[PDB]
Amino acid sequence: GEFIRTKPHVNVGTIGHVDHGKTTLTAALTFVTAAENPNVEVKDYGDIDKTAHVEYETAKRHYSHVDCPGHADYIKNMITGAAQMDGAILVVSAADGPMPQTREHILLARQVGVPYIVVFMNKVDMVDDPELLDLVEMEVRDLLNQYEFPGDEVPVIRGSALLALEQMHRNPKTRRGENEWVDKIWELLDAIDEYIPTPVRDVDKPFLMPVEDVFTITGRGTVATGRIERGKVKVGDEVEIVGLAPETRKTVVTGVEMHRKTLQEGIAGDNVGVLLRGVSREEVERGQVLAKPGSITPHTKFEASVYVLKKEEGGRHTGFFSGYRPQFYFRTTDVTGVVQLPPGVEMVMPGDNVTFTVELIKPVALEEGLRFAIREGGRTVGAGVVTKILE
Ligand SMILES: C/C=C\C=C\[C@@H]1O[C@](O)([C@H](CC)C(=O)NC/C=C/C=C(\C)[C@@H](OC)[C@@H](C)[C@@H]2O[C@H](/C=C/C=C/C=C(\C)C(=O)c3c(O)ccn(C)c3=O)[C@H](O)[C@@H]2O)[C@H](O)[C@H](O)C1(C)C
Ligand SMILES: Nc1nc2c(ncn2[C@@H]2O[C@H](COP(=O)(O)OP(=O)(O)O)[C@@H](O)[C@H]2O)c(=O)[nH]1
Ligand SMILES: [Mg+2]
């Protein structure tokens, strides 16, 4: 099976409170579009609620969609998943309204930079009262505004992921205009096509892909998955595996796939599987980056400009201090780092911007201008930018 690039590629996903319908909507999206484009493989709700990374396309674009379980123990996974989204679909149940996770996922989306949000008010089959429905929309729009998303401008589609999914199960060929529920899914697909702009991909820069996960394709070798950040990659390309391990490893690409389909060449923006030559799953891991040889190097000590979040922004009320060892989030991983403030400075208070030094306990592919977040456990306390590599 081969994958032929024909429409602009976009990465999206589902966020929202537990049980509001993220997984059901993900399944509905694949079934609904499958009726038009045969290249769209059907994905049962049972399987997704286990892969959780599916594909589907509209007349305008090809989409890679990650369905976030959204639980607290999956926080680190949501971070990397949301970080690679061009836009997110916020699912809110019409029968419950916004709940704690609706708010939590919105803040995380903001902190990792999700550029746009499209809302899908789910389970409307459970609520008919026009007033209650308008109240829920009002609440969601206000919630979004609260975290600085353009709440008054986002699309808010009302529908039922379950009824749409069941219709497709009954008639997999159901097409647009034939079923009111299925049509609500098309309203969402249209909103996604229109509201979420297709970003400019940095395809002309040196290849770089942060590793999300590593698997062994039984009888084929190890494969590293991730979203290409910049550049391109194809079979026969030499690539370096940088960071985390003791030394940088160099190998050759033996395969490139898009949703398990042979891909001519992967480009920035594509979430692919890169099969590597002679490397075991013990030589490549999440957090490392695949890159054009010599384009990026591993480091542990650097200087950075850092903004300490205010308590009013979810951070702490106490500041940073020398010897502090929080977690530093770089691309797809997080590593402990020791903070060292300049002479004379005993503390950097919330709300202040300062430049200090850091020494990670493990090497990481670093470069000037690279952004990173600082978290202490499950709380974001700082936002920084690498300003100088020391070693
Ligand atoms: C966020 C986790 C990892 C991020 C890692 C890296 O982040 C980056 O470095 C990123 C770059 C900026 C980063 O460093 N993010 C790191 C940080 C970035 C932070 C900014 C931008 C901000 O400005 C100060 C804006 C959100 C700003 O804040 C406001 C937020 C107020 C929140 C109040 C919540 C309070 C009282 C609260 O009790 C509360 C709640 O209500 C819900 C949930 N919980 C848990 C809470 O406790 C408003 O929303 C504004 O918009 C890049 O994205 C990297 O590529 C990435 C993704 C690798
Ligand atoms: N009545 C109704 N139930 C729904 C709808 N969408 C999802 N559900 C159900 O609500 C439950 C949670 O759905 P799921 O997609 O797993 O929620 P998630 O935690 O956000 O992923 C399941 O039992 C689904 O069948 C809907 O539109 N209407
Ligand atoms: Mg789910």
Short mmCIF file of C-alpha atoms and ligand atoms in Angstrom, two decimals:
data_model
loop_
_atom_site.label_atom_id
_atom_site.label_comp_id
_atom_site.label_asym_id
_atom_site.label_seq_id
_atom_site.Cartn_x
_atom_site.Cartn_y
_atom_site.Cartn_z
CA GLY A 1 0.00 0.00 0.00
CA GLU A 2 1.33 3.40 -1.05
CA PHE A 3 0.39 6.90 0.01
CA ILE A 4 0.29 9.60 -2.66
CA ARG A 5 0.42 13.23 -1.56
CA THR A 6 -2.43 15.06 -3.34
CA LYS A 7 -4.02 17.52 -0.88
CA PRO A 8 -2.50 19.84 1.73
CA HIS A 9 -1.81 17.93 4.97
CA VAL A 10 -3.07 19.11 8.37
CA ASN A 11 -2.77 17.70 11.91
CA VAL A 12 -5.73 17.93 14.29
CA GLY A 13 -7.08 16.08 17.32
CA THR A 14 -9.80 15.87 19.94
CA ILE A 15 -9.67 17.38 23.43
CA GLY A 16 -12.39 17.95 26.02
CA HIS A 17 -13.72 16.54 29.30
CA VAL A 18 -13.89 12.79 29.93
CA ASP A 19 -16.96 11.09 28.45
CA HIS A 20 -18.01 14.11 26.42
CA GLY A 21 -17.37 12.24 23.17
CA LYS A 22 -13.81 12.68 21.86
CA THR A 23 -13.36 9.05 20.83
CA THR A 24 -16.87 8.61 19.43
CA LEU A 25 -16.39 11.75 17.32
CA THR A 26 -13.01 10.49 16.09
CA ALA A 27 -14.63 7.26 14.88
CA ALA A 28 -17.54 9.15 13.31
CA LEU A 29 -15.13 11.39 11.41
CA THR A 30 -13.40 8.40 9.80
CA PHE A 31 -16.64 6.65 8.84
CA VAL A 32 -18.34 9.76 7.47
CA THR A 33 -15.43 10.70 5.20
CA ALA A 34 -14.81 7.06 4.23
CA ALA A 35 -18.12 7.22 2.35
CA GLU A 36 -16.56 9.68 -0.10
CA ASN A 37 -12.84 8.92 -0.21
CA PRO A 38 -12.12 5.16 -0.33
CA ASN A 39 -8.54 5.99 0.68
CA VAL A 40 -10.05 6.57 4.13
CA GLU A 41 -9.86 3.44 6.29
CA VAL A 42 -12.73 2.81 8.71
CA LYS A 43 -11.87 3.00 12.43
CA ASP A 44 -14.20 1.40 14.98
CA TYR A 45 -14.86 3.18 18.28
CA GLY A 46 -13.66 0.08 20.12
CA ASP A 47 -10.22 0.11 18.49
CA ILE A 48 -9.54 3.83 18.99
CA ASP A 49 -10.62 3.58 22.63
CA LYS A 50 -7.81 1.05 23.11
CA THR A 51 -4.61 3.03 17.30
CA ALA A 52 -5.68 6.50 18.46
CA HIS A 53 -4.00 8.17 15.47
CA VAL A 54 -6.22 8.07 12.40
CA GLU A 55 -6.52 9.69 8.99
CA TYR A 56 -9.36 11.06 6.89
CA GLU A 57 -9.73 13.61 4.15
CA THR A 58 -12.18 16.17 2.88
CA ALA A 59 -12.43 17.59 -0.63
CA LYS A 60 -9.90 20.19 0.50
CA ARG A 61 -7.33 18.51 2.75
CA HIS A 62 -5.81 15.32 4.14
CA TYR A 63 -5.93 15.02 7.94
CA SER A 64 -3.98 13.10 10.57
CA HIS A 65 -6.03 13.03 13.76
CA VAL A 66 -4.92 12.14 17.28
CA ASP A 67 -7.65 11.22 19.76
CA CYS A 68 -6.48 12.28 23.21
CA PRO A 69 -7.59 9.96 26.01
CA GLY A 70 -7.34 13.18 28.05
CA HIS A 71 -6.73 11.66 31.49
CA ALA A 72 -4.35 13.06 34.11
CA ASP A 73 -1.93 10.12 33.77
CA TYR A 74 -1.64 10.83 30.04
CA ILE A 75 -0.65 14.47 30.60
CA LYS A 76 2.83 14.12 29.09
CA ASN A 77 1.31 12.46 26.02
CA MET A 78 -1.26 15.23 25.60
CA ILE A 79 1.59 17.74 25.74
CA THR A 80 3.43 16.23 22.75
CA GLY A 81 0.20 15.43 20.94
CA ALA A 82 -1.20 18.94 21.27
CA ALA A 83 2.18 20.49 20.43
CA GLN A 84 2.00 18.87 16.98
CA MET A 85 -1.58 19.97 16.24
CA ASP A 86 -2.38 22.67 13.67
CA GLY A 87 -5.74 23.00 15.38
CA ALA A 88 -7.80 21.22 18.03
CA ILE A 89 -11.42 20.09 18.18
CA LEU A 90 -12.85 20.86 21.62
CA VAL A 91 -15.66 18.46 22.41
CA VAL A 92 -18.18 19.68 24.99
CA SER A 93 -21.29 17.72 26.01
CA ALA A 94 -24.51 19.71 25.65
CA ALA A 95 -26.00 17.76 28.55
CA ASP A 96 -23.19 18.69 30.96
CA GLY A 97 -21.66 21.94 29.77
CA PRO A 98 -17.98 22.83 30.42
CA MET A 99 -16.32 20.70 33.12
CA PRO A 100 -12.86 20.76 34.79
CA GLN A 101 -11.02 19.03 31.92
CA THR A 102 -12.57 21.36 29.37
CA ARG A 103 -10.74 24.14 31.19
CA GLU A 104 -7.58 22.08 31.77
CA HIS A 105 -7.22 21.02 28.14
CA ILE A 106 -7.81 24.60 26.98
CA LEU A 107 -5.00 25.96 29.14
CA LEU A 108 -2.62 23.21 28.01
CA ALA A 109 -3.55 23.89 24.38
CA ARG A 110 -2.69 27.56 24.95
CA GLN A 111 0.61 26.83 26.70
CA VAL A 112 1.79 24.45 23.95
CA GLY A 113 0.59 26.89 21.31
CA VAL A 114 -2.32 25.14 19.58
CA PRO A 115 -3.10 27.90 17.03
CA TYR A 116 -6.86 27.38 16.59
CA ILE A 117 -9.87 25.83 18.27
CA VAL A 118 -13.07 24.55 16.69
CA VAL A 119 -15.87 23.53 19.04
CA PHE A 120 -18.22 20.59 18.64
CA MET A 121 -21.14 20.65 21.07
CA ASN A 122 -21.83 16.93 21.34
CA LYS A 123 -24.79 14.87 22.59
CA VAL A 124 -27.41 17.36 21.39
CA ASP A 125 -29.60 14.28 20.94
CA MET A 126 -29.88 14.44 24.74
CA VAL A 127 -30.82 18.13 24.88
CA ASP A 128 -33.52 19.87 22.86
CA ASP A 129 -34.24 22.98 24.95
CA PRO A 130 -32.93 25.83 22.73
CA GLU A 131 -32.14 27.90 25.81
CA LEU A 132 -29.95 25.25 27.43
CA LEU A 133 -28.08 24.75 24.17
CA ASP A 134 -27.45 28.49 23.77
CA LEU A 135 -26.34 28.66 27.40
CA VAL A 136 -23.76 25.92 26.86
CA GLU A 137 -22.38 27.69 23.79
CA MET A 138 -22.21 30.95 25.72
CA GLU A 139 -20.33 29.24 28.54
CA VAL A 140 -17.83 27.61 26.18
CA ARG A 141 -17.18 30.86 24.31
CA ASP A 142 -16.58 32.67 27.60
CA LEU A 143 -14.31 29.89 28.86
CA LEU A 144 -12.19 30.16 25.71
CA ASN A 145 -11.97 33.95 26.11
CA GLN A 146 -10.78 33.41 29.67
CA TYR A 147 -7.58 31.76 28.41
CA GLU A 148 -7.21 34.19 25.53
CA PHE A 149 -8.55 32.12 22.65
CA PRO A 150 -10.93 34.08 20.36
CA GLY A 151 -14.03 32.60 21.99
CA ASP A 152 -16.45 34.88 20.17
CA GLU A 153 -15.05 33.91 16.77
CA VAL A 154 -14.60 30.14 16.98
CA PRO A 155 -16.99 27.87 15.10
CA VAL A 156 -19.42 26.03 17.38
CA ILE A 157 -21.06 23.08 15.64
CA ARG A 158 -23.92 21.27 17.39
CA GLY A 159 -24.41 17.56 16.80
CA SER A 160 -24.34 13.94 17.91
CA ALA A 161 -21.23 11.84 17.31
CA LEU A 162 -23.06 8.68 18.39
CA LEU A 163 -26.07 8.98 16.07
CA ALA A 164 -23.78 9.87 13.17
CA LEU A 165 -21.56 6.85 13.92
CA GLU A 166 -24.52 4.47 14.20
CA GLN A 167 -25.89 5.73 10.88
CA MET A 168 -22.58 4.99 9.14
CA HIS A 169 -22.57 1.55 10.73
CA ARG A 170 -26.02 0.96 9.25
CA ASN A 171 -25.11 2.44 5.87
CA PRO A 172 -21.32 2.87 5.37
CA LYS A 173 -22.14 4.54 2.05
CA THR A 174 -24.30 7.24 3.60
CA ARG A 175 -23.45 10.47 1.82
CA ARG A 176 -23.82 14.13 2.69
CA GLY A 177 -27.37 15.48 2.61
CA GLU A 178 -28.93 12.09 3.32
CA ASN A 179 -28.85 12.03 7.14
CA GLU A 180 -29.24 15.01 9.49
CA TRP A 181 -26.74 13.65 12.03
CA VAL A 182 -24.12 12.70 9.46
CA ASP A 183 -24.55 16.18 7.99
CA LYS A 184 -23.62 17.67 11.36
CA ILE A 185 -20.28 15.89 11.03
CA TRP A 186 -19.85 17.47 7.60
CA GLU A 187 -20.61 20.83 9.20
CA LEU A 188 -17.67 20.14 11.51
CA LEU A 189 -15.46 18.96 8.66
CA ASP A 190 -16.30 22.16 6.75
CA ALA A 191 -15.54 24.29 9.81
CA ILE A 192 -12.20 22.52 10.21
CA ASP A 193 -11.39 23.08 6.51
CA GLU A 194 -12.25 26.78 6.73
CA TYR A 195 -11.39 27.98 10.24
CA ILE A 196 -8.11 26.12 10.76
CA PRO A 197 -5.62 27.61 8.28
CA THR A 198 -3.04 25.39 6.57
CA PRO A 199 0.29 26.52 8.06
CA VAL A 200 3.41 27.13 5.99
CA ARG A 201 5.72 24.13 6.29
CA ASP A 202 9.49 24.68 6.58
CA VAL A 203 10.34 22.12 3.91
CA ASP A 204 13.47 23.95 2.76
CA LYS A 205 15.35 23.70 6.07
CA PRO A 206 17.56 20.82 7.31
CA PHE A 207 15.59 17.68 8.15
CA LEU A 208 14.50 17.37 11.79
CA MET A 209 11.88 15.09 13.35
CA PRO A 210 11.45 14.72 17.13
CA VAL A 211 10.85 11.07 18.01
CA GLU A 212 7.39 10.46 19.49
CA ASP A 213 7.50 6.65 19.82
CA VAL A 214 9.62 3.66 18.76
CA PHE A 215 8.37 0.24 17.67
CA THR A 216 9.66 -2.90 15.96
CA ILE A 217 7.69 -3.81 12.86
CA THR A 218 7.70 -7.59 13.32
CA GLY A 219 9.99 -8.99 10.64
CA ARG A 220 11.11 -5.59 9.36
CA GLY A 221 13.06 -3.75 12.03
CA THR A 222 12.68 -0.75 14.31
CA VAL A 223 10.56 2.23 13.30
CA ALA A 224 10.59 5.74 14.78
CA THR A 225 7.42 7.83 14.55
CA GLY A 226 6.90 11.55 14.81
CA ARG A 227 5.89 14.74 13.04
CA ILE A 228 8.54 16.21 10.75
CA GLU A 229 9.36 19.67 12.11
CA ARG A 230 11.33 20.84 9.08
CA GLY A 231 13.02 19.47 5.98
CA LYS A 232 12.31 16.16 4.26
CA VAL A 233 13.35 12.51 4.42
CA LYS A 234 13.44 9.52 2.06
CA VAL A 235 14.82 5.98 1.81
CA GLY A 236 18.59 6.10 1.44
CA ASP A 237 18.93 9.29 3.47
CA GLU A 238 21.61 9.36 6.15
CA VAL A 239 20.30 10.57 9.50
CA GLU A 240 21.71 11.18 12.97
CA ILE A 241 19.87 10.19 16.15
CA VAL A 242 20.60 13.03 18.57
CA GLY A 243 20.21 13.42 22.32
CA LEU A 244 19.55 11.35 25.44
CA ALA A 245 22.00 8.53 24.63
CA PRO A 246 25.76 8.71 25.41
CA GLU A 247 26.76 9.40 21.80
CA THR A 248 25.11 10.50 18.56
CA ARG A 249 24.27 7.57 16.27
CA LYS A 250 24.27 7.66 12.47
CA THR A 251 22.29 5.34 10.20
CA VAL A 252 20.38 5.20 6.91
CA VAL A 253 16.64 5.41 6.33
CA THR A 254 15.26 2.12 5.02
CA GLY A 255 11.64 3.22 4.96
CA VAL A 256 9.19 6.10 5.27
CA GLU A 257 5.46 5.56 5.82
CA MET A 258 2.30 7.61 6.19
CA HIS A 259 -0.28 5.74 8.28
CA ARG A 260 1.53 2.48 7.44
CA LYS A 261 1.58 3.23 3.71
CA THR A 262 4.79 3.57 1.69
CA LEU A 263 5.65 7.24 1.26
CA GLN A 264 7.89 8.57 -1.52
CA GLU A 265 9.32 11.30 0.71
CA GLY A 266 8.14 12.74 4.00
CA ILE A 267 7.98 16.52 4.34
CA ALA A 268 7.62 18.99 7.21
CA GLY A 269 4.17 18.67 8.74
CA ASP A 270 3.77 14.96 7.97
CA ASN A 271 3.40 12.62 10.92
CA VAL A 272 5.24 9.54 9.72
CA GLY A 273 6.96 6.31 10.60
CA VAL A 274 10.65 6.26 9.72
CA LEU A 275 12.11 2.75 9.48
CA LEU A 276 15.80 2.71 10.37
CA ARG A 277 18.66 0.46 9.30
CA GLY A 278 20.60 -1.70 11.74
CA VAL A 279 19.28 0.10 14.82
CA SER A 280 17.44 -1.72 17.62
CA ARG A 281 14.65 -0.20 19.69
CA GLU A 282 17.43 0.09 22.26
CA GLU A 283 19.27 2.63 20.10
CA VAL A 284 16.41 5.04 19.35
CA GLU A 285 13.85 6.43 21.79
CA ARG A 286 11.17 9.04 22.48
CA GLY A 287 12.74 12.46 23.02
CA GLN A 288 15.64 12.01 20.63
CA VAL A 289 15.47 13.71 17.25
CA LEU A 290 16.27 12.39 13.80
CA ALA A 291 18.08 15.03 11.78
CA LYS A 292 20.30 15.72 8.81
CA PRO A 293 23.84 14.76 9.89
CA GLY A 294 25.65 17.68 11.53
CA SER A 295 22.59 19.95 11.59
CA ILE A 296 22.04 19.69 15.35
CA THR A 297 24.12 18.57 18.34
CA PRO A 298 23.48 17.19 21.88
CA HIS A 299 24.09 19.44 24.89
CA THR A 300 23.50 19.68 28.64
CA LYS A 301 24.56 23.19 29.64
CA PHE A 302 23.01 26.38 28.28
CA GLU A 303 21.85 29.90 29.05
CA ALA A 304 18.25 30.92 28.47
CA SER A 305 15.87 33.83 28.79
CA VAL A 306 13.04 32.65 31.03
CA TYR A 307 9.68 34.09 32.04
CA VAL A 308 8.49 32.87 35.44
CA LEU A 309 4.71 32.43 35.28
CA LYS A 310 2.60 34.43 37.71
CA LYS A 311 0.45 32.67 40.29
CA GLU A 312 -2.44 34.20 38.35
CA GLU A 313 -1.28 32.24 35.29
CA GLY A 314 -1.24 28.91 37.12
CA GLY A 315 2.39 29.16 38.21
CA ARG A 316 3.72 29.31 41.77
CA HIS A 317 3.80 32.39 44.02
CA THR A 318 7.39 31.68 45.07
CA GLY A 319 10.17 32.29 42.58
CA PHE A 320 13.01 30.29 41.07
CA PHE A 321 16.27 29.83 43.04
CA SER A 322 19.72 28.38 42.38
CA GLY A 323 19.78 24.60 42.78
CA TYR A 324 16.13 24.27 41.70
CA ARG A 325 15.63 21.07 39.65
CA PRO A 326 12.36 21.26 37.67
CA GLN A 327 11.58 19.42 34.43
CA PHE A 328 12.53 21.03 31.11
CA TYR A 329 10.26 20.20 28.18
CA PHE A 330 12.03 20.14 24.81
CA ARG A 331 10.02 18.91 21.83
CA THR A 332 8.94 15.34 22.70
CA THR A 333 10.55 14.77 26.10
CA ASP A 334 11.27 16.32 29.49
CA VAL A 335 14.58 16.23 31.33
CA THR A 336 15.58 17.36 34.81
CA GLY A 337 17.78 20.46 34.82
CA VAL A 338 19.64 22.33 37.58
CA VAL A 339 19.00 26.08 37.67
CA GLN A 340 21.79 28.54 38.44
CA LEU A 341 21.00 32.23 38.86
CA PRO A 342 23.57 35.02 38.25
CA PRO A 343 25.80 36.21 41.13
CA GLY A 344 23.89 38.27 43.69
CA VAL A 345 20.47 37.06 42.52
CA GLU A 346 18.93 34.74 45.10
CA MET A 347 15.53 34.54 43.42
CA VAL A 348 13.55 35.28 40.27
CA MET A 349 9.95 36.11 41.16
CA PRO A 350 6.73 35.16 39.31
CA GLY A 351 6.00 37.65 36.55
CA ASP A 352 9.65 38.48 35.94
CA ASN A 353 11.82 37.79 32.89
CA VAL A 354 15.44 36.84 33.52
CA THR A 355 18.37 34.99 31.99
CA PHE A 356 19.97 32.11 33.86
CA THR A 357 22.00 28.96 33.27
CA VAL A 358 20.83 25.35 33.18
CA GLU A 359 22.54 21.96 33.29
CA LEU A 360 20.38 19.03 32.21
CA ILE A 361 21.10 15.60 33.69
CA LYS A 362 20.90 14.06 30.19
CA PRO A 363 21.98 15.39 26.77
CA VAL A 364 19.31 16.86 24.51
CA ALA A 365 19.41 18.05 20.90
CA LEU A 366 19.61 21.81 21.48
CA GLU A 367 20.04 24.92 19.37
CA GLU A 368 19.76 28.67 19.93
CA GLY A 369 16.21 30.00 19.74
CA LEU A 370 14.71 26.67 20.80
CA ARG A 371 11.69 27.20 23.05
CA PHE A 372 10.99 25.07 26.11
CA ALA A 373 8.64 25.02 29.07
CA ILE A 374 9.48 24.47 32.71
CA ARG A 375 7.19 22.36 34.88
CA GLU A 376 7.41 21.10 38.43
CA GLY A 377 5.43 17.90 38.46
CA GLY A 378 2.14 18.61 36.72
CA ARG A 379 2.33 22.41 37.03
CA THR A 380 3.72 24.84 34.42
CA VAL A 381 5.98 27.35 36.17
CA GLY A 382 8.06 28.87 33.37
CA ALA A 383 8.52 29.51 29.65
CA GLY A 384 12.02 29.89 28.25
CA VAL A 385 14.10 30.20 25.10
CA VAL A 386 17.64 28.87 24.65
CA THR A 387 19.93 31.88 24.15
CA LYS A 388 23.40 30.30 24.28
CA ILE A 389 24.83 26.79 24.24
CA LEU A 390 27.70 26.29 26.69
CA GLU A 391 28.34 22.57 26.24
C1 LIG B 1 2.81 23.34 28.41
C2 LIG B 1 3.70 22.11 28.52
C3 LIG B 1 4.80 21.92 27.74
C4 LIG B 1 5.23 22.85 26.76
C5 LIG B 1 6.41 22.66 26.09
C6 LIG B 1 6.94 23.60 25.05
O1 LIG B 1 6.35 24.64 25.20
C7 LIG B 1 6.72 25.77 24.47
O2 LIG B 1 8.11 26.03 24.83
C8 LIG B 1 5.83 27.02 24.95
C9 LIG B 1 6.27 28.32 24.15
C10 LIG B 1 5.65 29.53 24.74
C11 LIG B 1 5.98 27.19 26.46
O3 LIG B 1 7.09 27.42 26.98
N1 LIG B 1 4.82 27.13 27.27
C12 LIG B 1 4.89 27.26 28.72
C13 LIG B 1 3.90 28.29 29.22
C14 LIG B 1 3.39 29.24 28.41
C15 LIG B 1 2.46 30.23 28.97
C16 LIG B 1 1.90 31.23 28.23
C17 LIG B 1 2.20 31.40 26.73
C18 LIG B 1 0.97 32.22 28.94
O4 LIG B 1 1.58 33.53 28.88
C19 LIG B 1 2.27 33.84 30.12
C20 LIG B 1 -0.48 32.30 28.30
C21 LIG B 1 -1.13 30.86 28.21
C22 LIG B 1 -1.35 33.23 29.25
O5 LIG B 1 -1.54 32.68 30.30
C23 LIG B 1 -2.89 32.92 30.82
C24 LIG B 1 -3.27 31.70 31.63
C25 LIG B 1 -3.86 31.82 32.83
C26 LIG B 1 -4.20 30.62 33.58
C27 LIG B 1 -4.73 30.69 34.81
C28 LIG B 1 -5.05 29.43 35.48
C29 LIG B 1 -5.19 29.26 36.84
C30 LIG B 1 -5.00 30.42 37.81
C31 LIG B 1 -5.53 27.89 37.39
O6 LIG B 1 -5.72 27.74 38.60
C32 LIG B 1 -5.67 26.69 36.50
C33 LIG B 1 -6.76 26.56 35.58
O7 LIG B 1 -7.70 27.53 35.49
C34 LIG B 1 -6.85 25.42 34.74
C35 LIG B 1 -5.85 24.42 34.84
N2 LIG B 1 -4.82 24.55 35.72
C36 LIG B 1 -3.81 23.47 35.76
C37 LIG B 1 -4.69 25.64 36.54
O8 LIG B 1 -3.71 25.72 37.35
C38 LIG B 1 -3.76 33.15 29.55
O9 LIG B 1 -4.21 31.90 29.01
C39 LIG B 1 -2.70 33.74 28.62
O10 LIG B 1 -2.88 33.31 27.26
C40 LIG B 1 6.66 25.55 22.98
O11 LIG B 1 5.57 25.38 22.64
C41 LIG B 1 7.43 24.27 22.75
O12 LIG B 1 7.51 23.91 21.39
C42 LIG B 1 6.92 23.09 23.62
C43 LIG B 1 5.51 22.63 23.21
C44 LIG B 1 7.85 21.91 23.42
N1 LIG B 2 -26.16 10.04 23.74
C1 LIG B 2 -24.91 10.19 23.26
N2 LIG B 2 -23.90 9.49 23.79
C2 LIG B 2 -22.71 9.77 23.19
C3 LIG B 2 -22.46 10.66 22.16
N3 LIG B 2 -21.10 10.67 21.84
C4 LIG B 2 -20.57 9.80 22.66
N4 LIG B 2 -21.49 9.21 23.50
C5 LIG B 2 -21.23 8.18 24.50
O1 LIG B 2 -20.69 8.67 25.71
C6 LIG B 2 -19.66 7.77 26.18
C7 LIG B 2 -18.28 8.40 26.16
O2 LIG B 2 -17.82 8.55 24.80
P1 LIG B 2 -16.28 8.68 24.43
O3 LIG B 2 -16.19 9.07 22.99
O4 LIG B 2 -15.54 7.49 24.89
O5 LIG B 2 -15.84 9.94 25.36
P2 LIG B 2 -14.38 10.54 25.61
O6 LIG B 2 -13.93 10.16 26.97
O7 LIG B 2 -14.43 12.01 25.42
O8 LIG B 2 -13.49 9.96 24.57
C8 LIG B 2 -19.85 6.48 25.40
O9 LIG B 2 -20.72 5.57 26.04
C9 LIG B 2 -20.41 6.96 24.06
O10 LIG B 2 -21.27 6.01 23.45
C10 LIG B 2 -23.54 11.39 21.60
O11 LIG B 2 -23.52 12.20 20.66
N5 LIG B 2 -24.76 11.09 22.23
MG MG B 3 -11.71 8.88 24.58
#
